[PDB]
Design a protein around this nucleic acid. Structure first.
Length: 197
DNA sequence: CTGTGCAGACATTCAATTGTTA
DNA sequence: TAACAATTGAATGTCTGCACAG
């Protein structure tokens, strides 16, 4: 929102070159993949004389100066609360990215899923059939039925949940064993609920 | 972490629940 | 022991990964 309207920093000498050249290369090889066009474009940059590479830096440098001025001007025209709002937007954006990266790493190293709760089992089984338009409304329905469940009915699910708790512990034992072996001891649990930490 | 184009991955939204952690 | 993340589901976003250099 504040960050949305915020002046953007200029892109570098090579990235400028890239952005202008890409349309040109795309126009000439329309069925070629972007990744290859970029490899070709990098090559052209690399081949480009340093005098020609200077033109691009000189502009970036000049553009940096405008940014400095635009940023100062923008911040000067903001209120204490908008500033804090802007600081929070940036922090949040950073943390969101750091988070996403940790998750991807784990997914790539094929970390087992966490144990599915009785309620998870219930949602899996009863979702398709729940009354409601949107999946949001359908969940609200399942959630409601779940609340009204006889501990007699709830037990079926609690047993499946106990079954998954077993898989988890097993898959984990194996995965952690593998992690030590690929030298990623950092990814191990410091504390295990149903085993030695 | 920025630019591009796209394919495919992933976060949000409605909730509750729970292992792990601080 | 509270708080955080990740699960169950899907539609509907948005964001990354690749090919690069700065």
């Amino acid at each position: 929102s504040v960050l949305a309207s915020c002046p953007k920093k200029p892109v570098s000498s090579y990235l400028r070159f890239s952005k202008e050249q890409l349309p040109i290369f795309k126009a000439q090889n329309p069925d070629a993949k972007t990744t290859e066009l970029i490899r070709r474009i990098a090559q052209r940059w690399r081949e480009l004389p340093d005098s020609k590479k200077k033109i691009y830096q000189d502009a970036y440098r000049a553009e940096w100066q405008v940014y400095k001025e635009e940023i100062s001007r923008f911040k000067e025209q903001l209120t204490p609360s908008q500033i804090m709002s802007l600081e929070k937007e940036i922090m949040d954006k950073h943390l969101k990215r750091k988070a996403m990266t940790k998750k991807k790493e784990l997914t790539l190293l094929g970390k087992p899923k966490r144990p599915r709760s009785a309620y998870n089992v219930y949602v899996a089984e009863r979702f398709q059939e729940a009354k409601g338009d949107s999946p949001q409304e359908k969940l609200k329905t399942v959630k409601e039925n779940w609340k009204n469940l006889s501990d007699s009915e709830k037990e079926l699910y609690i047993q499946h949940a106990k079954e998954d708790e077993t898989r988890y512990h097993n898959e984990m034992k194996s995965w952690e064993e593998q992690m030590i072996e690929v030298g990623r001891k950092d990814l191990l649990r410091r504390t295990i609920k149903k085993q030695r930490k």
